[PDB]
Write a protein that binds this DNA or RNA. Structure first.
Lengths: 192, 194
DNA sequence: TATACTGTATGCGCATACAGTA
DNA sequence: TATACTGTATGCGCATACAGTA
């Protein structure tokens, strides 16, 4: 049930038209737009999308294309797990650089820089991170958030708190994946 | 140019159909849903809305009815301009209001390490729910002599204390009998992005 | 002429089936 | 049979104009 190259276009094209002109496109509009000389090319490109279950075609209704598949989500506890947990319509282009997901922080390791137990962490899904940055790493399937400081094979993860000590790692006898870069924080306690 | 009652209905019907079926309605659909026996009634009620500039009609395009309809960041504020003194705000970040509890109304750019020990850092965008009913113990955005302050509230009638979550700061004491004091709103959460 | 419509009427607008050709 | 199409037809689905009646 995977989308082809040209089928991805059509579906991306519908999303645009609905988002741009507030209404779904006609077959002839899809053809026109993409370059087909036959509206039937759109028809079958649509019929397929309906079978691969990404759209719903309404019989008779002009512009009767309803999208189906359809804001940054939080993972909760474990860096991405299919397909938990929450769904929150936040601005991704609010952080620098753009956030991809949220992680529910756990513990007071990064206290001294305003990262508290229970915060929602804004993270960028990348692997190129540099020294001194704040990062989400996964030491043996165990997701952790700290300040990075690598030296070849010796990777040091520092906490922002004086009661916590550096977590030293050696990739030669431990698995270690960078989940992403910490770009911002969102707190939503309803505390009294 | 305000809308007539029957025209307010028609506009609400479209608003719904779009939100219920993913696409604008036809003339016949409007006539059907509202009880007209003639789609021309839908046509004119639409043409009227087009004049009143609330919708746009696309010629020839079936269902060619286009409608013509987030949180803000308060600027550090010069004295004598209110909440919300205007143009102070500095921009709008289109977040989720129903994310926080109670629903957040605006963001204030925090200033200082007074609320450090609870994760409120100099330069965080604080989310705020505008209200004047804030209980003691809660965190509030108050205004001592047009001077927006953020702290933990402890009000004892006429003597009002503003408590900071930091050990190097002292509690700010206010006496309403000789200083103005506005509860601007309730601190419902924090947002950091720089 | 301006709202609020019922009724009738054209006719492009559009969805959609039945052919090809790669 | 499944993509990707070009081409042709068949008709309703639709916007809209032209009267009427309150």
């Amino acid at each position: 049930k995977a989308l082809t190259a040209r089928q991805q276009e059509v579906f991306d094209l519908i999303r645009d038209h609905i988002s741009q002109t507030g209404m779904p496109p006609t077959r002839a509009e899809i053809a026109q737009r993409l370059g087909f000389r036959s509206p039937n090319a759109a028809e079958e490109h649509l019929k397929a999308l309906a079978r691969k279950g990404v759209i719903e075609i309404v019989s008779g209704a002009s512009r009767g294309i309803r999208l189906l598949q359809e804001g940054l989500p939080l993972v909760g506890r474990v860096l991405a797990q299919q397909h938990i947990e929450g769904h929150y319509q936040v601005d991704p282009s609010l952080f620098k650089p753009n956030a991809d997901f949220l992680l529910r922080v756990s513990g007071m390791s990064m206290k001294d820089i305003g990262i508290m137990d229970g915060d929602l962490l804004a993270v960028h899904k990348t692997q190129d991170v540099r020294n001194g940055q704040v990062v989400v790493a996964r030491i043996d399937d165990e997701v952790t958030v700290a300040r990075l400081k690598k030296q070849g094979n010796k990777v040091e993860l520092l906490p922002e708190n004086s009661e916590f000590k550096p977590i030293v790692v050696d990739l030669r006898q431990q698995s270690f994946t960078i989940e992403g870069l910490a770009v911002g924080v969102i707190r939503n306690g309803d505390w009294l």
